[PDB]
């Protein structure tokens, strides 16, 4: 009675509007897509009376599935509305990233674990229990629900592309169990290679060219000297974000009992995920040893 806990599934913010959060939980970096993950129905479980007054388990699990399908269905529609109803790679990737995060929430292997997410975790603890075999029971429940949730996320494209529908987003890929940190490095990298050309483009309009072929515009010119300070802000953040994500990866990779074909370091994930990735170019970029920062920002 006004005591009802509720987290609304609001419109998705413009891509890269809010950067990766490396401050909230300092061991990890959270993407704004994850913070905005639709959890309306999962969160609502805190308010459900002890309907245990006349129920058991198999039922609880089924209730959970129906509620999770609804949150996944909303997420799918809102993500499509974010990509401006364009049924492309960008959308498929988000469906993969978000499907993945629902799985980690259920498995109790998610890295947000704060506020409403701590509330969703406690809700799942109430359904499944807290014994040693509770986490596997959860993992099992996920392995029997994971494809239904992906088909639930795709409902929006299906309903909107009636019969004029193709499988641009493949099941086998989206429903593939991978560690959270691996999936987020894939998402971060993708965001990075988008931010980067823009960031070099603004640094160029103010700094490319010499004061009669001899002297850099970054030496005596303030509009440029400024562009360098602001590009430095961005590259400083991405470097921090990278080192944080990289460390988490190292920790997780060791704990993991499952071998990932080809994945040895975080660099291997980007080389896998991104088209034409070069780790020497990346390493130089994040460490201000790139052609652009030297040629446009140092005297």
């Amino acid at each position: 009675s006004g005591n009802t806990v509720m987290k609304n599934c609001n419109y998705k913010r413009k891509r890269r509007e809010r950067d990766w959060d490396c401050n909230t939980k300092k061991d990890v970096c959270i993407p704004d897509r994850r913070y905005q993950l639709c959890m309306k129905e999962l969160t609502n479980l805190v308010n459900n009376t002890d309907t245990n007054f006349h129920r058991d388990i198999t039922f609880r699990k089924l209730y959970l599935k129906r509620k999770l399908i609804y949150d996944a269905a909303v997420e799918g529609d809102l993500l499509l509305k974010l990509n401006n109803y364009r049924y492309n790679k960008d959308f498929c990737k988000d469906i993969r990233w978000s499907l993945g995060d629902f799985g980690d929430i259920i498995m109790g292997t998610d890295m947000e674990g704060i506020g409403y997410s701590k509330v969703v975790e406690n809700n799942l603890r109430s359904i499944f229990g807290t014994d040693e075999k509770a986490q596997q029971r959860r993992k099992q429940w996920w392995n029997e629900s994971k494809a239904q949730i992906w088909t639930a996320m795709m409902y929006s494209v299906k309903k909107r592309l009636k019969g004029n529908f193709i499988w641009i987003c493949k099941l086998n890929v989206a429903v593939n169990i991978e560690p959270q940190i691996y999936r987020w490095i894939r998402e971060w990298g993708r965001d990075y290679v988008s931010e980067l050309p823009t960031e070099v483009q603004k640094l160029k309009e103010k700094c490319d060219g010499k004061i009669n072929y001899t002297d850099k515009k970054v030496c005596k010119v303030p509009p440029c000297q400024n562009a360098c300070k602001s590009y430095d802000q961005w590259i400083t953040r991405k470097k921090n974000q990278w080192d944080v994500l990289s460390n988490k990866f190292i920790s997780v990779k060791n704990a993991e009992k499952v071998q990932t074909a080809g994945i040895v370091t975080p660099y291997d994930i980007l080389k896998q995920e991104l088209d034409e990735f070069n780790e020497v170019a990346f390493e130089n970029e994040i460490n201000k040893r790139d052609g652009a920062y030297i040629e446009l920002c140092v005297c």
Epitope: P197, V200, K204, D208, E276, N278, V280, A281, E283, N284, E285, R289, D290, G291, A292, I294, E295
Partner: antibody, heavy 118, light 108 residues
């Protein structure tokens, strides 16, 4: 799949100018992050860095050759070139073009042998 | 100008053997060292950058160690296609300079 290929005569008479060009395929030479360079390997000798260029035009040379070396960039043709003047038999070597990652040469060309002879 | 000194100039090991090459710098390089593999009839390839980072794609047997003046390339288990000449290179400051190279030969 970025790839590098050198082209140019394999025979130069002494005192004449040595020209070679590298041509970038599978990507652009207009890289905002990489430099493009030349490396030499004289017979029975170690590797020597000749110089590198950024697509903007900014050039870096080895004092060892700075006297008679010039490296150009044709962003239009997706190429970069080497010109080493007044050659001697000390300039007979295998010439490689490489992608210069501010010191880490992460992609090389196959190399071309230039023999200085009359 | 900095001077790079590789030791030995040549070495012979058997397949499966642990082999180590060293690169000694004249001045101190802050671990700005690159290691290249030149196999016969092949262009040099980058194996290791920043003294110890193993480039993605190159075999797991290659390991780089060191900082300052003394560096080591280590091949944990020699293979027939490891018959090549290995070159070290600094990138601390212009000009970039290479060591003379170490020829690795396979006992059979």
């Amino acid at each position: 799949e970025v790839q590098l290929q050198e082209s140019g005569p394999g025979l130069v008479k002494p005192s004449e100018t040595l020209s070679l060009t590298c041509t970038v395929s599978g990507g652009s030479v207009s890289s905002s992050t990489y430099y493009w360079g030349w490396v030499r390997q004289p017979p029975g000798k170690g590797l020597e860095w000749i110089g590198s260029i950024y697509y903007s035009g900014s050039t870096y040379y080895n004092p060892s050759l700075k006297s008679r070396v010039t490296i150009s960039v044709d962003t239009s043709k997706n190429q970069f070139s080497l010109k080493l003047s007044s050659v001697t038999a000390a300039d007979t070597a295998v010439y490689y073009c490489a992608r210069d990652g501010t010191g880490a040469l992460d992609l090389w060309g196959r190399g071309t042998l230039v023999t200085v002879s009359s | 100008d900095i001077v790079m000194t590789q030791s030995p100039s040549t070495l012979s090991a058997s397949v499966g053997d642990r082999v180590t090459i060293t690169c000694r710098a004249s001045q101190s390089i802050s671990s700005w060292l690159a290691w290249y593999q030149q196999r016969p009839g092949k262009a040099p390839r980058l194996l290791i950058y920043k003294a110890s980072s193993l480039l993605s794609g190159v075999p797991s047997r290659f390991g780089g160690s060191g900082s300052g003046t003394d560096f080591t390339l280590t091949i944990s288990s020699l293979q027939p296609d490891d018959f090549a000449t290995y070159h070290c290179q600094h990138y601390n400051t212009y000009p970039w300079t290479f060591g003379q190279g170490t020829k690795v030969e396979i006992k059979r």
